Amino acid sequence: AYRFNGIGVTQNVLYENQKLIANQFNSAIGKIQDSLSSTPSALGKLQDVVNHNAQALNTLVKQLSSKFGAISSVLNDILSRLDPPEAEVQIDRLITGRLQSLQTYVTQQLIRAAEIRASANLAATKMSECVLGQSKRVDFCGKGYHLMSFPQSAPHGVVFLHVTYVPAQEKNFTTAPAICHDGKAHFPREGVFVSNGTHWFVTQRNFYEPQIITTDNTFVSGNCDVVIGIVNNTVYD
Amino acid sequence: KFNGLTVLPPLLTDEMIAQYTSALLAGTITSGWTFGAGPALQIPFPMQMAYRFNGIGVTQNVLYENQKLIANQFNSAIGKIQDSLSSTPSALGKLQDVVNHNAQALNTLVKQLSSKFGAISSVLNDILSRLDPPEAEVQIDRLITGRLQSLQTYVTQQLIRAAEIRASANLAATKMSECVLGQSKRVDFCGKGYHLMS
Amino acid sequence: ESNKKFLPFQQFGRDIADTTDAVRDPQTLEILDITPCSFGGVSVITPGTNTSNQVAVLYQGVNCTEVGSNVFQTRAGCLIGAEYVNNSYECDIPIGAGICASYQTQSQSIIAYTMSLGAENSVAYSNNSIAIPTNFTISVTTEILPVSMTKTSVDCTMYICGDSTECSNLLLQYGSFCTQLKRALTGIAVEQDKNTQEVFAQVKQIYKTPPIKYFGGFNFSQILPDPSKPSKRSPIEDLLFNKVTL
Amino acid sequence: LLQYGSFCTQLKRALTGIAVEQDKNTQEVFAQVKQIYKTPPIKYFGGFNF
């Protein structure tokens, strides 16, 4: 109820709809496992790291079979078939090639580690801001109005489950900026003026709940001859 | 068209990006921030602006009694934008830097092909038409090594630039999500002052 | 033919890239321009081998004259083996500037089309009308983020020279590249550990759930640890660990 | 050149990854909404010029 109050909805909305909200949450949680299992490439981000590491290691290992313009790629064959004075010429090219391969591998590893660190920092920020509290940033902890989040661990990564509130079943209404009464203007404290066609009420933001216009939810603050589009009607006490 | 160097076109054309921008503008004009979290809900513009003033700590009667002045100020500020953009000489240097860097890198890579790398000539046809197989490999190897080194340097530079480009793109996406589809309370994130819209 | 004004003493012609582009015929004084012959790359468009074995071929940045439905000119090049349709769908296989390819039953074939940005909508804006929601829905979404990667270490002597003393003596002359390599690898490993430490070690207390699992009608059994299994993981965690496999 | 190895495979992989990332950047930045909204024919918004 407090979390709903944090997004602009009163507590009585929850307290009168607890069972429906619980059932919807249970169904949404139940659908998650099927959604994860059915999707073929749902976890490609975690597989990419393993694939890249394996490919880099395989390439580094396979590079050892090159001759680099020498008689052979095996040191034992050169040592058992030759003598010191003419072995260095063959050895130098192999040394240079293997050093170049090692340098390339190290540079690639550093480049990948930078991006991995950036992703880890983003994940830490998301864990701090979406799990330990309620965030008002748009599209930061899901799509819609954020309520809460749950963390889960995965091989080399984290998974966040975001719970959000989505409006539905909208309706047409006629509205006015202010209400004129006894030569005085009236503005809503919180909410908006609304009319079903013959009578005027005041309602809240994201849930239709009309109320009788009264001095307890409006303030005068001005005159009637300044506001554009003002509509005059009775205000009760 | 160079020697084995090709430029690929982007997947999305400029017209599609313009259509996306127009759709975003129409949505934020007609529905406020409602379309960014669900179905789009209609609302008059002055009421939306009054709600936005209420979001920064100012009552609605302040807007409803000063609508014409606010509209005139907004119109003048919008009108000054084109002149401000046109008069400034280096207003769009960030976008020109990418093109300049790409052109410079391509030009350097192309120009590197004229080096000899300690050989008799930098043209393979001249070596082939003036010599025989047994003594051509010695000249060919140095050229091969030099060109391979140049290619590796170019690729490393391209990766280094792409990292920063990705960081900038992520920042732009976050700004679009937080300043256009809603109202932000973060200080100096969507302008200077108290943010209203974007 | 060339429209280049050669003075009576030039013979060749170069450009910014310093390559030959004009030449004069020794027998008859006449300037001629030289252009490189057409070249490009070839891309193969295909669905999964489980679906079908039909393919399409794209020659990148080529006019179709140089190379049934084999003829269709796009801004990305020449496309062979696909048919173009007026219709618009969500992009399946990107090709070029707004052109996508798909495998459609139409029988089954490969078609090319222009991608669609979405469904057109128009809200009836008015300056005395509003729209107010009357009901709500609770949604749950998932997000996946990588944290760390594998930590590796490399030995110079065994990888480059193995057990050859002469090779090690020769390599000793080059310098101290291996110290830099070892420092870089050690730093990478330490950073990999620090990433997980920062991400997961947020709280200093180990909290435990009450034995009675009643929370006003809310089910959390799918995310709470399962005591029956040995490793004490939630079913969702079990599925995640089973799906990701080398 | 065939004797040297498989540097060109790595170069091609890097370039292809760069191109795919370049496309993904624009896709993430600009494809935020799934609906194409249109402005009403009457351009009156309480006195505001757009």
Ligand SMILES: *[C@@H]1O[C@H](CO)[C@@H](O[C@@H]2O[C@H](CO)[C@@H](O)[C@H](O)[C@H]2NC(C)=O)[C@H](O)[C@H]1NC(C)=O
């Ligand atoms: C708000 O939406 C919910 C979700 O559809 C509605 O709950 C359903 O209502 C129908 C109509 O009788 C029932 O057949 C379903 O069994 C309900 N579902 C659940 C999970 O209870 C709810 O009625 C809507 N509220 C209003 C006021 O229209």
Ligand SMILES: *[C@@H]1O[C@H](CO)[C@@H](O[C@@H]2O[C@H](CO)[C@@H](O)[C@H](O)[C@H]2NC(C)=O)[C@H](O)[C@H]1NC(C)=O
């Ligand atoms: C919370 O949800 C779980 C998951 O649906 C429920 O576990 C099911 O319980 C029924 C009834 O005993 C069994 O037939 C199913 O086989 C169970 N599913 C699984 C995956 O074990 C659990 O009962 C729910 N909690 C409550 C209090 O109802």
Ligand SMILES: *[C@@H]1O[C@H](CO)[C@@H](O[C@@H]2O[C@H](CO)[C@@H](O)[C@H](O)[C@H]2NC(C)=O)[C@H](O)[C@H]1NC(C)=O
């Ligand atoms: C909104 O602003 C534009 C830009 O100033 C106005 O367009 C001008 O209109 C006047 C009067 O017709 C012309 O003399 C100018 O040449 C127009 N400028 C341009 C750049 O086209 C437009 O009239 C304004 N809208 C309203 C309703 O007044």
Ligand SMILES: *[C@@H]1O[C@H](CO)[C@@H](O)[C@H](O)[C@H]1NC(C)=O
């Ligand atoms: C609100 O009014 C507009 C204009 O007539 C209409 O198109 C729309 O369907 C109405 N909203 C609902 C929920 O019916």
Ligand SMILES: *[C@@H]1O[C@H](CO)[C@@H](O)[C@H](O)[C@H]1NC(C)=O
């Ligand atoms: C509008 O609400 C008033 C107050 O209850 C009611 O008397 C009237 O019948 C309503 N009008 C319609 C069209 O429902």
Ligand SMILES: *[C@@H]1O[C@H](CO)[C@@H](O)[C@H](O)[C@H]1NC(C)=O
């Ligand atoms: C109330 O509104 C009506 C309709 O605009 C108007 O004719 C009438 O004069 C208003 N009442 C007063 C006291 O001005």
Ligand SMILES: *[C@@H]1O[C@H](CO)[C@@H](O)[C@H](O)[C@H]1NC(C)=O
């Ligand atoms: C291909 O060549 C024809 C030959 O005249 C020409 O008309 C056409 O414009 C060329 N297409 C492109 C894309 O250059």
Ligand SMILES: *[C@@H]1O[C@H](CO)[C@@H](O)[C@H](O)[C@H]1NC(C)=O
């Ligand atoms: C594709 O479809 C529309 C349908 O009328 C047609 O008018 C358009 O010109 C077509 N474009 C072609 C054939 O290039």
Ligand SMILES: *[C@@H]1O[C@H](CO)[C@@H](O)[C@H](O)[C@H]1NC(C)=O
């Ligand atoms: C907006 O209000 C004006 C009153 O000046 C009116 O003329 C116009 O019709 C209104 N807009 C629409 C779409 O009805």
